[PDB]
Amino acid sequence: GFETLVVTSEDGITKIMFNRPKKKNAINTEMYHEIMRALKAASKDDSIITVLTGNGDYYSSGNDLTVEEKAKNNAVLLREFVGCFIDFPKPLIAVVNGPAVGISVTLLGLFDAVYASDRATFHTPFSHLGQSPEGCSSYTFPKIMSPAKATEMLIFGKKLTAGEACAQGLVTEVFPDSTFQKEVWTRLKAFAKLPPNALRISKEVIRKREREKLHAVNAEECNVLQGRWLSDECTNAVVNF
Amino acid sequence: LYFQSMGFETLVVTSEDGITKIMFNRPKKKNAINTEMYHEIMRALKAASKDDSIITVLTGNGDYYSSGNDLDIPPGGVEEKAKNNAVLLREFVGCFIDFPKPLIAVVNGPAVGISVTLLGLFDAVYASDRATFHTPFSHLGQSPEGCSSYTFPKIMSPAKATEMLIFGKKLTAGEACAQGLVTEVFPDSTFQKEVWTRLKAFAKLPPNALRISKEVIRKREREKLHAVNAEECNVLQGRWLSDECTN
Amino acid sequence: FETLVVTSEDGITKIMFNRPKKKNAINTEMYHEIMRALKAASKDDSIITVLTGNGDYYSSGNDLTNFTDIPPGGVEEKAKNNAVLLREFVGCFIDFPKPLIAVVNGPAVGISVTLLGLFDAVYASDRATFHTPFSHLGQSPEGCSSYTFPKIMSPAKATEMLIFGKKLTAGEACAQGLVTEVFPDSTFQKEVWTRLKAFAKLPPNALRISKEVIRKREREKLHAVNAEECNVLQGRWLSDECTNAVVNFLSR
Structure with missing residues (x-):
């Protein structure tokens, strides 16, 4: 099974939900491996569409604020993690139920569609913690949003509302929070x-x-x-x- | 190779004031594109590439831009039919890729299918607000064409293009403009005046x-x-x- | 520098175009001065570099007086030389290693607009307009705009600017990806510089x-x-x- 995910499949849709609501679905080492196992399974299962979503308040607070060999290993882990999304064979949809931070935002450039609640925010404060972009965002974000917008987000850590992320090409559509669930699932069941x-x-x-x-x-x-x-x-x- | 107009069976092709206008002309069939119209469009484009016009325009007659591909097996079966349609498609899209002059679409009404995907290869696209854009490829069990698998993610962003190309969503003129496929939208009652005043200026x-x-x-x-x-x-x-x- | 004012404080190098009486038109000397200012900025201790204009314009772009400076080698040699000069100018922006931000205080034209495609961010006053009338001038695109504008703005929008010479408002350029954000003219300097100093x-x-x-x-x-x-x-x-x-x- 899964300790950090709830994975379900039915009617041609596989749903992968992050399940550390007490920690704002922060991605620890366990979840990196579990997400990869789930995607490997979904790539070979009977579903037509795969959805990633968050339990509760946040979609994900990003990498969990949890040694040259540790940095090597984590870089190897990260590269394989990102590689799963790059190679994922079926439509992959994000259902962004709330605030999204870090690697959870950058991967969105590899998703096929992204639906967001009006209460979702998007934030990649890499440079603030002295780090660099990942999840291919150094390439995808300038292409999706334009360099003039990508820069504020990737280099300067501006936080985007769901409306802004929608306007800038990262999000397919935004629904009010009260009917978000209903609206997204009726669409996705239709697509399936x-x-x-x-x-x-x-x-x-x-x-x-x-x-x-x-x-x-x-x-x-x-x-x-x-x-x-x-x-x-x-x-x-x-x-x- | 022509003077002012060139007769075709499924197209009206005219040239004045520095503009060659190629107009789909099967209004009773929503300007659906049949085998005859594919070859006729290719000949018109060849002609427009060589005439003295500065700009070339593609538009539709009547209420539609084009309903896209018009919904006989050769001796080598449905397999040979598939290859023959694929070859014709490739050459057709090729003529748009290789067209050397500014090419502008005047989308007077609903556009479907290959007529929408080629818009990724146009220089400008002017739409009436009653124009709609639809590429229901997946609904018909098919995949993208007209270079849309490349141009649409680039133009619209992956997140917007997927909904169009993979899930078959229909866009209003305003949505297609917001997402970069359309240069500008005009009220239907000004559309012809406003568009043709610009185009004559451009020329x-x-x-x-x-x-x-x-x-x-x-x-x-x-x-x-x-x-x-x-x-x-x-x-x-x-x-x-x-x-x-x-x- | 005769045609620029270059200063540095709070982690920011500011390069300001300084021919306000000529709408900050880029004459031959300003091309060389900008290159030298960028060379100096690439190696100074600032972390952000800013380009902006003095007076009411950002820049009116290439100075048409540049066509009247006819060398002893005639127009053919001049054409070859100025094309190399342009190539090396634009290449300075391509290779610039630190965050480069445009602060567009007023109308911007020509090469000054095209270069915006190579910047990291672009902040504009609501008084700013953007115009690349290469076709009117019988010229063709420069500053990598032939590649960057279609990518940034979409072919459908880029063509109208690049081929047909549409002038954009600050709001339209922001909507179409050239500009990061637009501010009311009255609060523009304080809002931009408060931001840049935080970024630094x-x-x-x-x-x-x-x-x-x-x-x-x-x-x-x-x-x-x-x-x-x-x-x-x-x-x-x-x-x-x-x-x-x-x-x-020139008759205008």
Whole structure:
């Protein structure tokens, strides 16, 4: 089973829900491995669409504020983690139920659609903790949002409302919080009735030609990040947090 | 190769005031694109590429822009039919990729299918607010075409393009403008006046400068676009032979 | 510097265009001065570099007086030289290693707009307008805009600016991806500088390295695009269309 996730499947939809509500669904080492196991399963299961979502208040507070060998290992872990999203074969949808921070935001550039509650916020304060972008965001975010918008978020740590994230290309659509659940699931159940192989083959035509590039971006990002974790600037920034 | 107008069976093709206008002309069929119209569009584009016009416009007659592909098996079966349609598609999309002059769409009404996906290859797109945009490929058991699998994520962002291309969502003119597919939307009652006043203005700009500027923008993308086209057409061949497409 | 004012404080180097009586038009000397200002800024102790204009304009772009400075080698040599100069100017922006922010205080035109595509952020007054009338001038795109504008704004929007010479309001440029944010003119300086001074307090290696991971893998493409745009211009400049245009615009 799963300690940190609740994974369910029915009617052509697999739902992966982060399940550390007391910790704002902060991603610890366990959850990194569990998310990868769940995605590996979903890639081979009978579902047409896979959804990631959060339990409760937050979608995710991002990497859990939990040694050269540790930075190597974590960089290796991170690279494999990101690689699962890059290689994921079926439509992948984020259902962003509340605030989203860190690696949980950056991965959104690898998702096929992203629905957000009006109470969702989006925040990538990497530079504030003395680190660099990951999840391929160094490549995807400038492309999605434009460099002039991506920069405020990636380099300068501006926090976006769900409306702003929608306007800037990161979010497909925003629903009021009161009916968010209803509105998203009625849509997704509708999508799960579409010809299965058509959906799968359509995403492959869109994604396949980009994967080699996205894997190289990931590798570059994790290298830089490994460097940042070993730096005095990062330890001081994080200690000073 | 023509003087003022060139007769076609499914198109009206005219040239005045520095603008070649290519208009779909099957209004009783919602300007659906049949085999005849694919070949006729290709000939018109070849002609427009060589005539003295500065700008070329694609539009529809009547209430639709185009309802897209119009819904006989050769001796080598449905497999050969699939390859033949894939080859025709590839050459067709190719003519749009390689078109050397500014190419503008005047979307007077609903656009569906291949007529929408090619808009990714246009220089400008002017829509009436009663224009709607729909690419229900997946609903018909098919996959993207017209280089949309590449151009649409780029233009609209993946998050918006997926909903259009994979899940078959229909966009209003305003949504398509908000998401970068449409240059500008006009009220239907001003549409023809406003669009044609601009276009006639545009056609008075220094002609070589307009052509050379389009070419600086587009030339270095062509090899990639031709490669996307070939891949999409190859995938589509397989879809057309699948249970989902037929059933 | 004759045509710029370069200062540095609070972790920010400010390069300000300084020909207000000529709408901060970029003459030959200003091209060289900007390159030198960026060279100095690349190695100084600031963490953010800002470009802005003095007076009511950001910049009116290339100074058309630049076409009248005819060397002893004639217009052919001049065309070749100025194309190389342009190539190396734009390449300074492509290669600039620290966060580079435009503070667009008023109307911006031509090369001054196109370069915005290579900046990290762009903050504009609601008095700012953006115009790239290359076609009116019988010219073709520069500053990598032939690649960056379609990517940033979408082909459908980029064409109207680049080919057909539409002038954008600050709000439209913000809506279309060129500008990060727009502020009321009355509060613009205080709102922008309050922000920039906070940004300058962020861990400086993180800021530098984050920019490098975003920008480094795209630089070879950008240099190739710049090289091709410049090769075309070298031709355009010697066209009847550009000659006739420049004689008209010089009469304005």
